[PDB]
Design a protein around this ligand. Sequence first.
Ligand SMILES: Nc1nc2c(ncn2[C@@H]2O[C@H](COP(=O)(O)OP(=O)(O)O)[C@@H](O)[C@H]2O)c(=O)[nH]1
Ligand code: ALF
Ligand SMILES: [Mg+2]
Lengths: 305, 119
Amino acid sequence: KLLLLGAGESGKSTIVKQMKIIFSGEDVKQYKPVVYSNTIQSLAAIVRAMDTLGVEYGDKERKTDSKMVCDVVSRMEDTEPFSAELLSAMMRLWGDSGIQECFNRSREYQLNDSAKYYLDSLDRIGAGDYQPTEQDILRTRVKTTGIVETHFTFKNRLFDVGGQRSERKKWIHCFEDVTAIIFCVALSGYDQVLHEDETTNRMHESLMLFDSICNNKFFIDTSIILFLNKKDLFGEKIKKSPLTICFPEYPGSNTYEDAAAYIQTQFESKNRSPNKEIYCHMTCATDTNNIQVVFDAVTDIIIAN
Amino acid sequence: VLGWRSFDLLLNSKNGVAAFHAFLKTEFSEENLEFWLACEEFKKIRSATKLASRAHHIFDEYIRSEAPKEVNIDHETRELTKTNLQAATTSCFDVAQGKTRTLMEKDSYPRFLKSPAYR
Ligand SMILES: Nc1nc2c(ncn2[C@@H]2O[C@H](COP(=O)(O)OP(=O)(O)O)[C@@H](O)[C@H]2O)c(=O)[nH]1
Ligand code: ALF
Ligand SMILES: [Mg+2]
């Protein structure tokens, strides 16, 4: 029995799609829609935040193709293949300096994780013949509700859940006899806020969450493995976004190694019983090797029992 | 009968809904549908007071923080509902119901089709 628990948008589900790649056409045919949404949406997000932040368009003539997108999101017709005029309206838009200016401030609002990745493939996916990439399926986002169980045997039971606060009351169920628990944590969250209340620091919620999950009685003789996921997003931002935005205290220098050291110490300290050990891992749910390599190691800690 | 595999067809099927529900009940997210069927009845009330009454009850059952059948909406959705609750109108829980529909549709619905329950 394995619990893939964690806060919201930490990738508890992107990790399950690597337990799969370790996707029949019937399925790949299913993510075509999803990838459409994630794209149109992400673009939508930056359009809206353009107003909320006061970010002038690099070209007035964009207000046009711009609004043409929001209507799509609105008309709900955003799960269907980009009409010619759209795939362009977006490409032309995704190419305005304003959009970029407001996009670079994407920490000030809620914007899809895979926003960049998809928009940097507007053309690539806007093909009449288009079929979803091994990655395209992974970089997708679909808020998981309830507990989703999947099975499989590697070296001789999986439980997915919802990360938001209103899902956590349902967790208590599959809490009986949990072999090990993989706990996802979006490194990127250190300077963002929860989806549920535009107040709480995502990073902080993770810590308060883990602290709860970590020292639970049900898991005294249970393996606690921690996945400090999204280490890639974390790296490209740590250089221009102080870790102090999360820990006023943080005395280190803003570098991948430094901040990771600290962020790793904070979680490990939320552990009580000295008669116990935890397993950190700078993962990246959207890179099969890394997940593959790490999951292997994990299977050990578990089998090493 | 079979058209289910549009989503709203599943919803407008006194048989469909009851079915889907059994699925969710195991998957642990039947509150989404309960809240949805709720807002559906809510809509049929004409009496201003009876509306305020239920508006408050739905809130305490589904929206309220740590509510029993608390649904998964975002900050902006919740406050908005919270404000609407300040004057029970039939359009009160619209957005909340809205977002909820999607959550079921794009998430638990598919995983629902491809499964025993729908075979
Ligand atoms: N760039 C990037 N995206 C990631 C990583 N891990 C998860 N994501 C993306 O972040 C969003 C949230 O992950 P998801 O599995 O939905 O987390 P869940 O909130 O537990 O479902 C999705 O767009 C994922 O593909 C990562 O290491 N790098
Ligand atoms: F926390 Al999730 F989809 F599992 F947002
Ligand atoms: Mg999920």
